[PDB]
Amino acid sequence: NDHNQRNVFRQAITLNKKIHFQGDPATKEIISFHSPYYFDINEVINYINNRNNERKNKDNEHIWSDEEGNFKFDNENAHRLFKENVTPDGSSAGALNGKLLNFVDRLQSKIFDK
């Protein structure tokens, strides 16, 4: 695996751990990658699959359209990339478009392994 594939795996897990955590916001902000709370690993790939299909806008940023509407990709508003029914919007390839496709096939081989 490369380093950007390694990075996206951590940003998937460290953020999915935050969303599924149902406590006070104070200890929500101390949640880390090494921290042991529940995270959905199927949505981790769903974050990666969309991060495999990025496309930036004219102003060097990512525009993403979901059933709620077209939204910016930033810190507050990246938690809605965890479902499969999310469509991208852009012209050129994203910062990780086509790079994480090999990372998906190794992950689903691990989960669906008997």
Partner DNA sequence: GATCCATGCGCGT
Partner DNA sequence: ACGCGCATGGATC
The size of the chain, in residues, is 114
58 binds DNA (CB under 7 A): yes
109 binds its own copies (CB under 8 A): yes
Distances in Å between the Cα of 37 and the Cα atoms of 3, 13, 46, 53 are: 24, 10, 19, 28
27 to 56: interface string for its own copies, x by CB under 8 A: --xx-x------------------------
What is the distance between the alpha carbons of residues 62 and 55, in angstroms, rounded to a whole number?
Answer: 6
Please report where in the chains the tokens 């990658």 appear, as a residue: 33
Q: Which residues bind its own copies (CB under 8 A)?
A: 1-3, 7, 11, 29-30, 32, 60, 75, 92-93, 95, 97-98, 102, 105, 109, 112-114
